[PDB]
């Protein structure tokens, strides 16, 4: 197979490639925008 | 031994069949699958696929009645989605419990 | 379908585990007298 | 056109797959059960 | 974790278990804690009684009822 | 103009013709919905 | 004023429940079609001398273009048309259960 | 004439389906007591005809009528011509009106009748497996018992007021 | 022109306009620093 | 219904005609709706062994309108069979040169693989223009809703919708525009 | 709004501006802490291409959009509705608001294709005469990103790519 560290960016298994799109940064959203309120 | 794995691709075919059977007879009045059978368990209706089907064929009558239940407890769940829950419970959201 | 909600109302998720429409008996007598009880 | 390079789902040079949405969930709806499960298992 | 799950009785799945909580089972079940789905064991009517075996029921609220009527409430 | 009959057909004089059979069992109470022949015991 | 579906095609379906809430009643009486509604039946469809006698107008069709008459008549495809062999004749089941 | 919470008409503005409104709960509580008296006086008055129910047998539903047949697969430890009553009915309908269970009816409000007329043994069926290139094969015949009821009668009561 | 993926203007005549659905560099005082997107 | 036995079978298996308006809507949702009428799924009585399709009429297929830049993107590709016979053309060159292609093509990619496709398709009848033959007009039944809806251009708008909608902002007075 | 006329007489010129009736922002705002025309109006987030009534005070009488610093917009907004106005042209909408011909111009007649939700200009397109893998396919945008926070009352949101 392949080493641990590669030239190319290695293809994950499928459940870490889920984990990862999982735990995924999620900003935080104001009820209003900013800029519409004075 | 196809006729032996055979008698698992029948029933399979069959809850296909009555699916779209049942499909069919809930856009004539103006509904989808999903809104039919999902609102008769709300109701408390235990009607399975080859009842449903087989009624929407020989008792169309029938199958409209049923087709206006599921609409109308359809309706009280988005009307109960609106409120806070400060307005009651709807007719047809009612559960009769079992002791 | 309905399984969810069945769970949300102390019912099971599937009708055929407990309740009236499985635990009662599925016929009996015309006379009136009692079937015996079902093997399940 | 369109070759994967040898078998599809190993070796060097893959076919991608990609996370459906329902997928996630799937997985969410795990994660909530065994966090539930961290709870009675502290008392 | 093959073995945990024959040692707490845990082969069929989708089949309920009652075990106690206490240290030593609770560590069997750290092991197998994401193959498991854990509630409490609930008594509104109590612990039953000699008279109630043959007439409880295990709810899906996780409720141990020892009256199983079978009849619409008259409430 | 009130509807007492309405049958099928491939022709329209098939259909006039199945519609007054129609007709004619509903008048004579021999329709297909009519309740089923009593063989409980007299009582 | 409110009715879940429309009460013009089918029959007028009227829902309701009892006093314990046990048992769903429907109401479901037919609708019949006006008479306004309606098309009247087409009913309607000399110095002669020899009586016009019945003239048969069996015209000779050759196998090609009869199957074009019948698959445009019946929409369909020119295949169904076509014989088959005496093994399939003879596998056909003449006398098979007949259900009501 | 304009309120905090008014939006211009857009195809966005509002949702694309119906405002719809339902009945007064008050109002609509006198009006379901008016259809279950008419229900019933129609069935005093026997104005009705032949009627279909489902009843829930066997793990299974069955819509029928009367002098039907419906196959089973499996003993019932009943003699041949012995009377029982189907007690789970999940509806019983009409041409003109429907009753519905919540799931189940009420014993004092329908009652369905069957009759056992043949007990016998279903036709062979073949259990063969086999697996490639493993010398894996073998068969196996079973005759399922059968009994066959025969729907002889399904009769309504006034009591639902 | 010249095919570029990095375009870049080489004097102040030279002007960014997006045309046929890419990035071009025109310049009429030295018609050289013409470029592509590539 | 109290019927015979040979005509009630004769009203329940009954072929019906369909009409589709193809004005200013896209060919796939004609399709989908064009597609389940032709196979029969909109019958209770639906089975593939039964030869319950309709037919469907489906007339101004000239004036299909595509979403997004699919007249230039979207390309119709055939293969002669012959050595260099492998032609591609996008859906504005195909329309042109045949008005009812797109539609069709579309509807025959969405009934199911088999032997009975070409059967379904000698079931439909595509026009570019509104004009429909006597015959075909004489054995219609229903006319089915256009899926999209077709919105209004700014000169369509009566004065009072223009006079109900409130203006915005203010210009000012000193702008040439 | 102002106006500029020229008139000759006698191989002379002259010019004068003259102003015109300009129209006055409806009174009673919904929402008078809005900062620009949409948010005053509780429109944000709620109209599309199609909604031309909105569109059409934006834009000249030739098709071209407003400047920012008059109509008071948010650069949020400006770009979005810029953007509606380019797809309002290209399906029709807007039939009154032509490009100027010079004198002594007919256009020619050409393939009237009908479309909407166009986002590039049709002559700046090219075929797809190679769609890819499932896996890499080529797909066909439809729409515009910058009105994929728009207010959804389905269950499935925009798909922008076909
Ligand atoms: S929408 Fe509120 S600032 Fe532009
Ligand atoms: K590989
Ligand atoms: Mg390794
Ligand atoms: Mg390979
Ligand atoms: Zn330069």
């Known amino acids: 197979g392949s080493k641990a560290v590669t030239r190319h960016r290695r293809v994950m298994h499928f459940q870490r490639q889920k984990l990862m799109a999982v735990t995924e940064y999620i900003p935080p959203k104001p009820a209003i925008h900013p800029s519409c309120l004075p | ?80 989605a609106l409120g806070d829950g400060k307005e009651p419970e709807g007719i047809f959201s009612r559960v009769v419990q079992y002791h | 379908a309905g399984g969810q909600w069945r769970l949300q109302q102390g019912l099971a998720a599937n009708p055929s585990g407990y309740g009236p429409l499985t635990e009662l008996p599925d016929w009996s007598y015309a006379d009136g007298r009692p079937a015996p009880p079902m093997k399940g | 056109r369109g070759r994967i390079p040898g078998r599809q789902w190993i070796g060097k040079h893959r076919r991608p797959r990609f996370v459906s949405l329902r997928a996630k969930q799937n997985m969410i709806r795990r994660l909530e059960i065994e966090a539930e499960n961290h709870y009675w298992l502290s008392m | 974790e093959k073995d945990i799950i024959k040692m707490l009785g845990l082969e069929k799945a989708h089949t309920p278990q009652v075990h106690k909580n206490i240290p030593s089972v609770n560590a069997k079940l750290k092991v197998v804690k994401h193959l498991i789905r854990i509630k409490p064991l609930k008594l509104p009517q109590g612990l039953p009684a000699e008279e109630n075996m043959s007439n409880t029921c295990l709810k899906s609220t996780g409720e141990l009822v020892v009256q199983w009527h079978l009849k619409p409430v008259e409430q | 103009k009130k509807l007492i009959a309405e049958g099928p057909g491939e022709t329209v004089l098939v259909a006039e013709e199945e519609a007054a059979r129609v007709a004619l069992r509903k008048l004579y109470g021999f329709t297909e919905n009519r309740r089923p022949w009593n063989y409980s015991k007299p009582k | 004023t409110y009715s879940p579906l429309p009460d013009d095609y089918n029959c007028n379906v009227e829902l309701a429940l009892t006093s314990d809430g046990r048992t769903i009643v429907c109401y479901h009486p037919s609708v019949d079609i006006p008479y306004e509604h309606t098309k009247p039946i087409p009913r309607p469809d000399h110095d002669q001398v020899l009586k016009t006698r019945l003239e048969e107008k069996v015209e000779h069709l050759e196998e090609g273009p009869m199957i074009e008459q019948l698959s445009k008549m019946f929409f369909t495809t020119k295949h169904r048309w076509y014989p088959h062999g005496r093994y399939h004749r003879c596998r056909k089941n003449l006398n098979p259960p007949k259900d009501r | 004439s304009y309120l905090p919470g008014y939006v211009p008409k857009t195809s966005l503005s509002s949702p694309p389906w119906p405002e719809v409104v339902l009945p007064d709960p008050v109002e609509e ?26 009843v829930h047998f066997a793990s299974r539903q069955w819509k029928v009528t009367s002098e039907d047949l419906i196959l089973i697969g499996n003993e019932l430890d009943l003699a041949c011509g012995e009377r029982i009553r189907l007690e789970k009915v999940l509806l019983v309908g009409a041409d003109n009106f429907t ?47 059968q009994t066959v009821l025969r729907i002889n009668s399904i009769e309504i009561a006034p009591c639902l007021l | 022109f010249k095919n570029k993926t990095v375009l870049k203007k080489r004097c102040k005549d030279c002007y960014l306009v997006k045309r046929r659905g890419r990035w071009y560099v025109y310049c009429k005082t030295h018609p050289r620093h013409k470029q592509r997107q590539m | 219904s109290s019927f015979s036995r040979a005509p009630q079978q004769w009203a329940t298996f009954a072929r019906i ?92 990619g969405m009934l199911p693989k088999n032997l009975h496709r070409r059967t379904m398709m000698e079931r439909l009848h595509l026009f570019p223009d509104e004009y429909i033959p006597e015959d075909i007009l004489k054995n219609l039944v229903e006319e089915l809703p256009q899926p999209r809806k077709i919105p209004k251009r700014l000169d369509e708008y009566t004065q009072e919708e223009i006079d109900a909608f409130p203006r915005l902002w203010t210009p000012p007075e000193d702008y040439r525009l | 709004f102002r106006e500029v006329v020229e008139t000759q007489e006698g191989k002379t010129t002259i010019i004068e501006g003259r102003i015109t009736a300009t129209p006055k922002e409806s009174p009673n705002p ?84 009908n479309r909407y939700l166009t986002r590039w200009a049709p002559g700046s397109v090219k075929p797809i005469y190679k769609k890819g893998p499932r896996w890499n396919r ?25």
């Open chain 10, 17 to 108: 005609w369909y009409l589709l308006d193809g004005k200013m809507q896209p060919p796939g949702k004609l399709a989908a709706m064009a597609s389940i009428r032709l196979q029969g799924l909109h019958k209770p009585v639906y089975h593939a062994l039964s030869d319950c399709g309709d037919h469907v009429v489906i007339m101004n297929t000239r004036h299909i309108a595509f979403s997004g830049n699919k007249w230039e993107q979207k390309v119709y590709s055939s293969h002669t069979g012959y050595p260099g016979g492998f032609r591609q053309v996008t859906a504005a060159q195909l329309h042109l040169r045949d008005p009812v292609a797109i539609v069709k093509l579309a509807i025959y």
């Open chain 11, 138 to 162: 080529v797909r066909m945008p439809v729409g515009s990103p910058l009105l994929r926070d728009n207010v959804c009352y389905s269950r499935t949101p925009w798909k922008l790519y076909h």
């Open chain 2, 1 to 80: 031994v196809k006729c032996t794995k055979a008698r698992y691709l029948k029933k399979k075919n069959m809850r296909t069949l009555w699916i779209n059977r049942i499909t069919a007879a809930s856009q004539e009045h103006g509904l989808k699958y999903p809104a039919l059978i999902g609102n008769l368990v709300k109701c408390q209706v235990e009607l399975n696929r080859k009842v449903l089907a087989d009624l929407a064929i020989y008792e169309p009558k029938t199958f409209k009645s049923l087709a206006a239940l599921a609409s109308r407890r359809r309706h009280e769940g988005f009307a109960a």
């Open chain 8, 99 to 145: 009753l519905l269970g919540k799931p189940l009816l009420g014993k004092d409000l329908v009652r369905v009748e069957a009759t056992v007329i043949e007990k016998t043994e279903s036709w062979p069926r073949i259990i063969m497996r086999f697996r490639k290139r493993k010398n894996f094969k073998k068969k196996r015949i079973v005759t399922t018992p």
């Open chain 11, 30 to 113: 919904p929402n008078p802490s809005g900062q620009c025309p949409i948010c005053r109006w509780n429109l944000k987030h709620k109209y599309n291409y199609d909604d031309v009534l909105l569109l059409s005070q934006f834009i000249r009488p030739h098709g071209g959009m407003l400047p920012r610093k008059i109509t008071g917009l948010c650069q949020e907004e400006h770009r979005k509705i810029e953007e509606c106005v380019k797809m309002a042209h290209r399906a029709g909408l807007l039939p009154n608001h032509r490009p100027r011909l010079p004198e002594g111009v007919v256009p020619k007649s050409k393939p009237q294709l």
């Open chain 8, 29 to 54: 509580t006198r009006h379901h007591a008016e259809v279950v008296k008419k229900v019933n006086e129609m069935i005093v008055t026997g104005q009705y005809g032949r009627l279909f129910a489902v």
